[PDB]
Enzyme design. Structure first.
Site: not given
Ligand SMILES: Cc1cc2nc3c(=O)[nH]c(=O)nc-3n(C[C@H](O)[C@H](O)[C@H](O)COP(=O)(O)O)c2cc1C
Ligand SMILES: Cc1nc2cc(OC(F)(F)F)ccc2n1-c1ccc(C(=O)NC2CC2)s1
Ligand SMILES: O=C(O)c1cc(=O)[nH]c(=O)[nH]1
Ligand SMILES: CCCCCCCCCCCC[N+](C)(C)[O-]
Length: 375
Positions: A67, A69, A89, A114, A116, A118, A185, A187-188, A239, A268, A288, A317, A338
């Site tokens: 979230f 990073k 990470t 995603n 991403c 790292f 992850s 993604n690497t 993790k 993860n 999610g 979730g 998240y």
């Molecule tokens: C965009 C994105 C980037 C993430 N980056 C990492 C990460 O860098 N390291 C990690 O351990 N998990 C990473 N995650 C996984 C989240 O930390 C979390 O474990 C996962 O989204 C499950 O939680 P949630 O269902 O509440 O979203 C990432 C997830 C998302 C969606």
């Molecule tokens: C919680 C929240 N509230 C927000 C209000 C916003 O609008 C404003 F910028 F304020 F005008 C913009 C982003 C916002 N986030 C978001 C934070 C992270 C988000 C997101 O999608 N992550 C992508 C990985 C899924 S989305």
């Molecule tokens: O950086 C990423 O792509 C990433 C790392 C991780 O631990 N989990 C994930 O869903 N994405």
């Protein structure tokens, strides 16, 4: 509640419909950096505090890794009402990550995918950001007792994971309350194969060893060595990904007990989700609502396979107080959010703390700790 939270949900509503997901995220981060998010200034109920060994959480909700990073707005995210945050990470060197777009959201199912890879600024910059946070923490009444963990990983062209972990530890370890070893992850390439028992054991031990060696070089008192919240060496977590065989799981369970790891983050993201139509196009790990059941069951198994010995941090979730109690009953001590942040908005922690409290009362628990593992 508050109006401030109200406007942001409106802005968020807009952004989810029209704006690219990574852009929305960066935008959120930029608002945090500027310190214009709302504050939850309320006292958390003493009945929902929690701990993992000697690491104390004022409340049971934190934000998951990935979230913030680069630790660019730790204060502001914590001030939303979370007890802790996990930054990273991170990797030894700064990295762009994979090709954009690499983040997609499905609102109706409340899921994210995603790839991403790292993307982060690298250890030295993130360490500098953590240091500045820790200096502010000393001056800011709202940040006292808040926990910051650092998730660590490897550069994508790095052959030796361990060397990457060690370097991170020596740079940023002093400033962390805990260190999460990311071997999960998707993604690497491969990385996920580091969860095989032999490599994992070696990995945990080297992590634990480098942390111990932090303490040996220096001339100062502990009060000054550990510039973190607990004032002690960071705890060590790992993790895990949920995409593993039952035999694999039992075998990872074994090595955790053997190495005496301080905790496990379950779990993860997953690649085993097939029924999200907007995500057929797409590659990577899934977050999610659809992850909730899989993740829950994974907590049960690992709690069982470790004989309730290894503290669990739950992911993901988790959206409701109910979702949250499920994790806790299944064996989690603390919960990370998240997606909930993404779909429910800035109010997420305030909303969810109340619901966990209201629900802890209807089930007639005396406090949160009593609910842990009560299947
Ligand atoms: C965009 C994105 C980037 C993430 N980056 C990492 C990460 O860098 N390291 C990690 O351990 N998990 C990473 N995650 C996984 C989240 O930390 C979390 O474990 C996962 O989204 C499950 O939680 P949630 O269902 O509440 O979203 C990432 C997830 C998302 C969606
Ligand atoms: C919680 C929240 N509230 C927000 C209000 C916003 O609008 C404003 F910028 F304020 F005008 C913009 C982003 C916002 N986030 C978001 C934070 C992270 C988000 C997101 O999608 N992550 C992508 C990985 C899924 S989305
Ligand atoms: O950086 C990423 O792509 C990433 C790392 C991780 O631990 N989990 C994930 O869903 N994405
Ligand atoms: C710069 C003030 C404009 C704010 C209007 C939209 C968001 C309001 C939230 C402001 C809260 C900032 N603060 C003081 C809580 O940190």
């Amino acid at each position: 509640y508050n109006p401030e939270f109200f406007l942001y949900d409106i802005f968020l509503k807009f952004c989810l419909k029209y704006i690219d997901g990574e852009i929305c995220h960066d935008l959120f981060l930029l608002l945090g950096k500027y310190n214009i998010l709302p504050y939850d200034t309320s006292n958390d109920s003493i009945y929902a505090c929690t701990n993992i060994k000697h690491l104390d959480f004022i409340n049971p909700f934190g934000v998951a890794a990935g979230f913030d990073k680069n630790g660019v707005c730790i204060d502001s995210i914590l001030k939303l009402g979370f007890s802790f945050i996990e930054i990273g990470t991170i990797t030894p060197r700064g990295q762009t990550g994979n090709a954009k777009p690499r983040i997609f959201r499905d609102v109706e199912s409340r899921s994210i995918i995603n790839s991403c890879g790292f993307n982060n600024m690298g250890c030295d910059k993130v360490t500098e950001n953590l240091i500045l946070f820790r200096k502010r923490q000393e001056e800011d009444k709202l940040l006292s007792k808040h926990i910051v963990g650092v998730s660590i990983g490897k550069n994508k062209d790095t052959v030796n994971i361990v060397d990457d972990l060690k370097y991170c530890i020596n740079k940023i370890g002093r400033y962390a309350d805990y260190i999460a070893i990311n071997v999960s992850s998707p993604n690497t390439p491969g990385l996920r194969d580091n969860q095989e028992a032999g490599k994992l054991k070696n990995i945990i031990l080297s992590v634990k060893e480098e942390i111990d060696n932090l303490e040996k070089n220096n001339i100062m008192n502990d009060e000054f060595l550990w510039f973190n919240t607990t004032k002690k060496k960071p705890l060590v977590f790992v993790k895990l990904a949920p995409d593993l065989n039952q035999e694999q799981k039992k075998e990872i369970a074994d090595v955790l007990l053997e190495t005496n790891i301080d905790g496990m983050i379950i779990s993860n993201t997953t690649t085993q989700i097939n029924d999200i139509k907007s995500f057929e196009n797409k590659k990577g790990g899934v977050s999610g609502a659809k992850l909730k059941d899989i993740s829950t069951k994974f907590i049960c198994e690992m709690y069982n396979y470790t004989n309730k010995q290894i503290p669990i941090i739950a992911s993901g979730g988790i959206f409701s107080g109910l979702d949250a109690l499920e994790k806790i009953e299944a064996g989690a001590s603390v919960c990370q959010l998240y997606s909930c942040l993404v779909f429910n908005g800035m109010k997420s922690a305030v909303q969810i703390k109340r619901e966990l409290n209201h629900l802890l009362y209807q089930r007639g628990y005396y406090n949160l700790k009593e609910a842990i593992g009560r299947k």
